[PDB]
């Protein structure tokens with residue numbers, strides 16, 4: 001484990017995702033509202049999945065070597081197995097908050113799968129220049145997601161209860177800022193141009209992951225928007 | 232790329248799926264009917280997924296070598312990753328058109344997963360004679376799907392609006408004819424008996440894919456069956 | 463095939479899953495109740511999936527070698543591909559029986575995916591002591607599932623029709639007893655401590671699989687709880 005300088009950030013990430021999972025699990029014990037139960041189930045699964053994948057990276061299972069640039073490059077593939085399941089769950093939290101229609105939910109989840117799937121292909125591609133073709137396709141899929149979150153959901157939240165509109169607006173802004181950083185870290189990190197070393201890259205993804213999952217969840221599950229209007 | 236004679240058909244397929252995706256995306260911009268939005272989302276995702284997998288084959292990522300018959304045989308595995316997601320989406324288009332019940336939808340999607348999954352196992356199997364055992368199981372799963380589309384959905388469409396009944400009947404006939412060709416191309420192509428060479432096999436799958444996805448989508452999204460009855 | 467002593471139990475399992483699939487398929491022909499159709503579709507898919515994965519193990523495709531303990535250990539990975547899809551389908555049978563809320567269904571299916579996913583990682587892990595870390599995480603996920611089936615569903619079934627309450631109680635008890643045996647067989651078998659040899663381990667999993675899928679299905683599909691109350 002300790003033979004890799006980035007191990008400290010993988011261990012911290014593992015701990016923070018595990019602690020986040022347990023807090024949400026305990027906090028959700030005393031909840032019977034069927035609407036609130038939906039948000040607790042979605043939001044608790046997110047850091048639980050991330051916990052297992054951070055642990056796999058810490059123990060060395062989620063790491064492979066990819067030859068490109070005449071070098072064997074360490075690629076943590078477990079990140080994409082994490083994101084494949086956690087990013088659509090996070091979008092479902094937002095879509096259920098605004099009572100989005102089914103067709104829009106399917107478009108979001110499908111574009112998200114394309115985003116993560118093409119990012120994985122780009123991470124494992126051995127022809128250096130082709131890695132950035134996949135990065136560009138994946139980034140186009142992300143821009144579609146961000147467009148929908150702004151010019152489809154925002155207008156839908158305003159016609160909703162005030163507390164669900166204000167909570168959505170906050171979580172929307174958090175998501176757009178944090179998610180946009182991921183393609184940048186990829187491009188300048190060891191998967192892309194190799195400007196930033198792997199140990200610093202790992203620290204950046206850990207800060208982003210914890211903020212986008214645990215921080216996101218703390219804002220959502222403390223809001224009254226997750227409960228139905230009741231007397 | 233150009234070192235493979237089949238590259239021209241992979242490049243054409245990539246272009247036609249990309250163009251198809253963009254047309255459906257633009258055409259769906261001016262749509263607010265929640266029913267129509269469902270069909271546009273399903274139908275636009277189909278060629279978008281196929282685009283990415285054709286590109287992976289063009290660039291050489293979606294290709295592996297499988298030893299059988301005393302030879303290293305080029306097997307494009309990316310086809311099955313495509314079909315795993317696009318064939319159930321196409322069946323969902325048909326099932327939603329006739330307002331099929333949930334139990335029937337699950338049976339269709341499950342049989343479809345078995346069809347594609349066993350076809351993938353057959354494509355990667357190293358014992359030559361066993362490849363055709365998997366082909367037979369996969370073909371049995373397809374025949375179940377075709378039976379349901381005829382002796383379960385057809386009777387359901389007649390009790391529906393006339394425009395949804397006539398549109399379903401057309402898309403049903405297109406699907407049964409085109410899908411039935413796939414097991415035949417597999418059997419006589421490089422995955423099976425090896426009668427037809429890979430470059431011709433690739434041309435045939437490209438014609439079938441574009442027809443079953445883009446051609447299918449053009450018929451559906453030009454129909455009024457996708458809109459609810461409104462004044 | 464016959465070069466492996468466990469082949470006899472893989473062949474028996476294949477036959478019993480295939481026969482089970484055909485019986486459920488025939489029995490479900492004469493069913494039009496939309497509620498009953500749901501249970502028949504879920505319950506017939508379970509042994510059909512298991513059939514294909516037992517066949518892959520029989521023919522040698524679903525087997526790999528994992529080095530640990532200074533030895534190349536035969537690991538049947540196809541079991542986890544089976545369980546990944548069949549265990550959530552079995553939980554869906556139970557959840558639909560008691561009309562569970564959506565949030566609870568998602569929590570069950572998500573915990574089940576974590577259970578199977580971490581068990582697969584543990585089966586393929588090359589550092590011997592780490593294999594049991596994954597076993598423990600997977601077992602914690604199972605205990606969560608069992609808790610929900612007892613202290614969330616049981617109370618919900620009592621407020622239901624008497625026949626659905628008594629049928630659920632029976633299937634609940636069958637599930638908790640049979641599922642609990644799996645982590646024990648893993649721990650003492652070739653994936654874990656290696657006390658029980660592989661051929662005996664394979665026999666035990668076959669008895670458990672057939673009972674948990676075909677036996678489970680025979681109890682459910684003979685009950686009147688799967689039909690709506692009708693005159």
Ligand SMILES: CC(C)CCC[C@@H](C)CCC[C@@H](C)CCC[C@@H](C)CCOC[C@@H](CO)OCC[C@H](C)CCC[C@H](C)CCC[C@H](C)CCCC(C)C
Nearest residue numbers: 109110113114117118120121124280283295308311312316
């Ligand atoms: C509606 C939305 C959900 C739609 C989703 C969008 C999606 C279509 C976007 C594209 C996804 C696609 C790129 C997934 C590729 C997975 C692949 C990286 C797995 C590893 O295989 C890659 C190479 C080794 O580098 O295999 C070496 C050769 C091996 C012999 C490969 C044989 C196994 C194949 C991988 C079998 C295909 C399985 C499916 C891809 C499983 C789904 C994986 C997940 C990442 C989507």
Ligand SMILES: CC(C)CCC[C@@H](C)CCC[C@@H](C)CCC[C@@H](C)CCOC[C@@H](CO)OCC[C@H](C)CCC[C@H](C)CCC[C@H](C)CCCC(C)C
Nearest residue numbers: 340341344345348349351352355511514526539542543547
């Ligand atoms: C309700 C419906 C959706 C049900 C679906 C029906 C489905 C059950 C039908 C059978 C599907 C099954 C054959 C999928 C097999 C995937 C497999 C080809 C992936 C590549 O692995 C094959 C060998 C190399 O040749 O791995 C070499 C050895 C490696 C060490 C393998 C270890 C990884 C395992 C593959 C882990 C299992 C992952 C799941 C199979 C992922 C789903 C893939 C998709 C193709 C279903």
Ligand SMILES: CC(C)CCC[C@@H](C)CCC[C@@H](C)CCC[C@@H](C)CCOC[C@@H](CO)OCC[C@H](C)CCC[C@H](C)CCC[C@H](C)CCCC(C)C
Nearest residue numbers: 049052064077080081085571572575576579580582583586
């Ligand atoms: C809501 C719920 C459904 C959530 C589900 C819970 C889930 C997150 C729990 C953890 C699942 C995770 C451990 C799955 C790992 C699959 C992995 C074993 C496949 C084989 O790859 C392992 C190594 C060889 O030993 O690959 C060698 C290196 C290769 C180069 C690997 C590159 C391919 C990657 C495997 C791509 C990721 C694909 C996804 C993991 C596909 C889903 C598989 C299924 C088992 C979940």
Ligand SMILES: *C/C=C(C)/C=C/C=C(C)/C=C/C1=C(C)CCCC1(C)C
Nearest residue numbers: 119138139142179182183186209212
């Ligand atoms: C909890 C994890 C989250 C919210 C991860 C989000 C990840 C992304 C938005 C990743 C995007 C990428 C691109 C847009 C292209 C480059 C490759 C990716 C996958 C890093």
Ligand SMILES: *C/C=C(C)/C=C/C=C(C)/C=C/C1=C(C)CCCC1(C)C
Nearest residue numbers: 350369370373410413414417440443
């Ligand atoms: C857009 C792609 C489509 C509609 C693909 C359809 C593919 C099939 C219907 C494939 C069927 C197969 C068999 C029936 C057995 C032989 C292997 C397959 C997977 C080619």
Ligand SMILES: *C/C=C(C)/C=C/C=C(C)/C=C/C1=C(C)CCCC1(C)C
Nearest residue numbers: 581600601604641644645648671674
């Ligand atoms: C039809 C198959 C069924 C119902 C299989 C159930 C399997 C389990 C409940 C497996 C549980 C495991 C653990 C709890 C940890 C050890 C590894 C597993 C996956 C065997």
Ligand SMILES: CCCCCCCCCCCCCCC
Nearest residue numbers: 181182184185195196197200204
């Ligand atoms: C979206 C965030 C990207 C900003 C990356 C900042 C990295 C600064 C760290 C110093 C770079 C290390 C280079 C010298 C080793």
Ligand SMILES: CCCCCCCCCCCCCCC
Nearest residue numbers: 016019020023210211214215218
């Ligand atoms: C009462 C609110 C705080 C509860 C404690 C939460 C502990 C989980 C770890 C959170 C750290 C990361 C927060 C986002 C920066």
Ligand SMILES: CCCCCCCCCCCCCCC
Nearest residue numbers: 412413415416426427428431435
């Ligand atoms: C379902 C369509 C299958 C028909 C295949 C027709 C192939 C004819 C092309 C000529 C065969 C090439 C053999 C000589 C190289």
Ligand SMILES: CCCCCCCCCCCCCCC
Nearest residue numbers: 247250251254441442445446449
């Ligand atoms: C107005 C209808 C035609 C629009 C142009 C569609 C261009 C997408 C490519 C379609 C070619 C394949 C059609 C099926 C044979």
Ligand SMILES: CCCCCCCCCCCCCCC
Nearest residue numbers: 643644646647657658659662666
């Ligand atoms: C949950 C069931 C686990 C019980 C396992 C009993 C196995 C007894 C078979 C004899 C053990 C073989 C050891 C000598 C070869």
Ligand SMILES: CCCCCCCCCCCCCCC
Nearest residue numbers: 478481482485672673676677680
């Ligand atoms: C009339 C009920 C029996 C029908 C025959 C079922 C045959 C399928 C194989 C069942 C054997 C396994 C039963 C569970 C132990």
Ligand SMILES: CCCCCCCCCCCCCC
Nearest residue numbers: 084085088089092105109113
């Ligand atoms: C490729 C993996 C995608 C599945 C991720 C799991 C979450 C799915 C959310 C589905 C939302 C409901 C759509 C109607």
Ligand SMILES: CCCCCCCCCCCCCC
Nearest residue numbers: 546547550551554567571575
């Ligand atoms: C990782 C694979 C999980 C999917 C298994 C297929 C069954 C899914 C059941 C979904 C139940 C409905 C949830 C609302």
Ligand SMILES: CCCCCCCCCCCCC
Nearest residue numbers: 139143146147150180183184
């Ligand atoms: C185009 C939709 C408007 C909202 C999206 C904001 C774009 C942020 C740019 C992200 C940069 C990634 C490289």
Ligand SMILES: CCCCCCCCCCCCC
Nearest residue numbers: 370374377378381411414415
């Ligand atoms: C048996 C259901 C009737 C409709 C299915 C038509 C069968 C077409 C044969 C396909 C040939 C594939 C080898």
